[PDB]
Design an enzyme around this catalytic site. Structure first.
Site, short mmCIF file in Angstrom:
data_model
loop_
_atom_site.label_atom_id
_atom_site.label_comp_id
_atom_site.label_asym_id
_atom_site.label_seq_id
_atom_site.Cartn_x
_atom_site.Cartn_y
_atom_site.Cartn_z
N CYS A 67 -3.71 -1.42 13.22
CA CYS A 67 -4.32 -2.26 12.32
C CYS A 67 -4.66 -1.61 11.07
O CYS A 67 -5.30 -1.56 10.14
CB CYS A 67 -5.73 -2.75 12.82
SG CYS A 67 -6.82 -1.55 13.73
N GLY A 68 -3.52 -0.45 10.77
CA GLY A 68 -3.66 0.26 9.61
C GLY A 68 -4.98 1.13 9.44
O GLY A 68 -5.23 2.00 10.29
#
Lengths: 254, 138
Positions: A67-68
């Site tokens: 998720c970055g």
């Protein structure tokens, strides 16, 4: 490549919709309680405003890792909030959702009261309640004087960021403002977007002739834990919506 | 001859069905509600409610909250609710005894946080055994 991302969008949107009856009823009763009590003058444990010497910080992360900088950004903002508190001479203790974030803070010698599994895609009211009971046990014992939380939330139609909010003491002004803001999630492009709308409460005010089985103060006091759990669960659903947004972003970057 | 009974938790409606009679665990005692009751608002303790749809009883453990009764609508708001059909009565006797002892132990102790934690667990285990075993006075 699969369209089932929309399925979890819709399942999340379903749980958020399913939370509305609770908040509508909370609001209705609060509104009628206001006509017997001045909320600002109410003295009850969950409203206690002690001089703040110690703070509990609830840090909300996810354990699924693609998720970055979703988790990294939460963790950095919480570190920064804790540095601010330390600069002011305040003590603190951490309550951490997400085991990997718990380890990040553990290795750096932070005080940790409790740890829970990373934020689940559709956060449970039992999940919220376990956390809430733990935050009550810190706050009502006067182990801490304020409980804050840090979680990721949509702040524009497209973007989300960590936010820092206060959970305890409860705010009288929050008790008088009804559950007005409801938010619908929707996948538009290959990115995820939130729209928030104001809604007039659908249901009427309580009858004038309604019997109060206990004094209004005691009914308010029975309500306050529900208000807390409603606030916490809403923050967790915001955090999950933001994490789905981040994880879709991460997919489509690849 | 009918009330609609709804138990609403923060994430979902847990119970929604017609009933002839509902027993509410109010903070001042078990309240008995029949059809055509005058409007009423009450606090609810952590404890057991009971619902009779025709001639049989169903018990639900409630984690505290409030109830309104108006025009044959009983609306129950709780932090959590569990159908007594779901709870293993042997297990719940076990857990209640264990929470009883852990509570006694916390109370000998120094830590208000522990006392609260153990009281929370004790009340939850109580309501679950009342709901599994159907007897309020335990």
């Amino acid at each position: 490549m699969r369209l089932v991302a929309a399925a979890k969008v819709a399942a999340a949107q379903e749980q958020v919709m399913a939370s509305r009856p609770f908040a509508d009823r909370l609001a209705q009763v609060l509104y009628s309680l206001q006509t017997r009590l001045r909320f600002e003058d109410v003295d009850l444990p969950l409203l206690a405003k002690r001089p703040v010497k110690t703070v509990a910080l609830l840090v909300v992360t996810g354990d699924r890792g693609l998720c970055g900088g979703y988790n990294t950004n939460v963790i950095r903002r919480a570190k920064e909030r804790l540095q601010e508190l330390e600069a002011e001479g305040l003590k603190y203790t951490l309550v951490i959702v997400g085991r990997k974030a718990a380890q990040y803070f553990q290795r750096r010698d932070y005080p940790i009261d409790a740890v829970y599994s990373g934020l689940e895609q559709i956060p449970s009211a039992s999940e919220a309640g376990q956390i809430a009971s733990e935050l009550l046990s810190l706050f009502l014992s006067e182990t801490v004087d304020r409980v804050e939380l840090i979680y990721t939330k949509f702040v524009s139609l497209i973007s989300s960021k960590p936010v820092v909010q206060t959970l305890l003491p409860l705010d009288p002004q929050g008790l008088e403002t009804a559950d007005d803001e409801i938010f619908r999630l929707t996948t538009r492009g290959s990115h995820l977007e939130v729209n928030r709308e104001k809604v007039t409460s659908t249901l009427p005010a309580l009858p004038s002739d309604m019997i109060f089985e206990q004094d209004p103060l005691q009914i308010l006091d029975a309500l306050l834990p529900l208000y807390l759990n409603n606030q916490l669960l809403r923050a967790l659903q915001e955090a999950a919506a933001s994490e789905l947004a981040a994880r879709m972003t991460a997919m489509n970057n690849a | 001859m009918v009330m609609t009974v709804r138990v609403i938790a923060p994430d979902k409606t847990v119970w929604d069905a017609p009933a002839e009679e509902v027993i509410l665990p109010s903070t001042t005692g078990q309240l008995g509600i029949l059809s055509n009751h005058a409007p009423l608002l009450t606090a609810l303790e952590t404890g057991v409610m009971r619902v009779r749809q025709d001639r049989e009883w169903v018990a639900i453990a409630l984690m505290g909250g409030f109830a309104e009764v108006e025009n044959n609508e009983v609306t129950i708001l709780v932090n959590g609710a569990e159908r007594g059909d779901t709870i293993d009565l042997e297990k719940a006797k076990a857990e209640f005894a264990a929470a009883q002892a852990a509570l006694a132990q916390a109370e000998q102790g120094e830590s208000k946080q522990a006392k609260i934690q153990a009281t929370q667990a004790f009340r939850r285990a109580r309501a679950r055994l009342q709901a599994a075993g159907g007897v309020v006075e335990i």
